[PDB]
Amino acid sequence: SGAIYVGNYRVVNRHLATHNDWANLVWEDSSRDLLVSSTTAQGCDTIARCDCQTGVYYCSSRRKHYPVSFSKPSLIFVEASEYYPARYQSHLMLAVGHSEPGDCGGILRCQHGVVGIVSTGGNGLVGFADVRDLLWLDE
């Protein structure tokens, strides 16, 4: 679990969105596993606007942060699950590192700010849903 709070927006994994998230929906994209809902209290996370390929992510299954090198956002195959059938997930970034079901929502950060959130894993790899392209999150 985990969310990004920027301005009057809450950014979560689409498969983990709550009833409240859907009742205050701003935008959702099943192919990115992203959902953005509106909030009443102001958020103070800063979003990175860059093409950084190194950063640090929070892994809740180890209660630790890990430094990672990660690939550029692209179309990557994701196995079938209880939430989605087998498909290519867009805007996805891979890194070598520990992740297990329950780690989705952990933030990935660089010196510029929030890069994305954990969305996929397994095979000794971790996948991150990029948020850097969502320029409207700051307006």
Ligand X SMILES: C[C@H](C(=O)N1CCC[C@H](C(N)=O)C1)c1cncc(F)c1
Q: Which residues are annotated as a binding site for Zn(2+)?
A: 50, 52, 110, 112
- Is 104 an active-site residue? yes
Shortest separation between residue 12's beta carbon and ligand X, angstroms: 12
Nearer Cβ to ligand X, position 95 or 104?
Answer: 104
Nearer Cβ to ligand X, position 8 or 31?
Answer: 31
Query: Which residues neighbour 117 within 8 Å (Cβ) at sequence distance 6 or greater?
Result: 2, 3, 4, 11, 12, 13, 104, 105, 106, 107, 108, 128, 129, 131
Whether 26 and 36 have beta carbons less than 8 Å apart is answered as yes
Which is catalytic among the residues 15, 29, 45, 98? 15
Whether 128 and 93 have beta carbons less than 8 Å apart is answered as yes
52 contributes a contact to Zn ion by CB under 5 A? yes
Nearer Cβ to Zn ion, position 98 or 112?
Answer: 112
Tokens 């939430």 found at:
83
Shortest separation between residue 117's beta carbon and Zn ion, angstroms: 15
Q: Which does 76 bind (CB under 5 to 8 A by kind): Zn ion, ligand X, none?
A: none
Exposed e or buried b per residue across 89-109, where buried means at least 16 C-beta atoms within 10 angstroms of its C-beta: bbbbbbbebebeeebbbbbbb
* Residues 83-102, interacting with ligand X (CB under 6 A): 83-84, 89, 99-101
- Residues with catalytic roles: 15, 33, 104
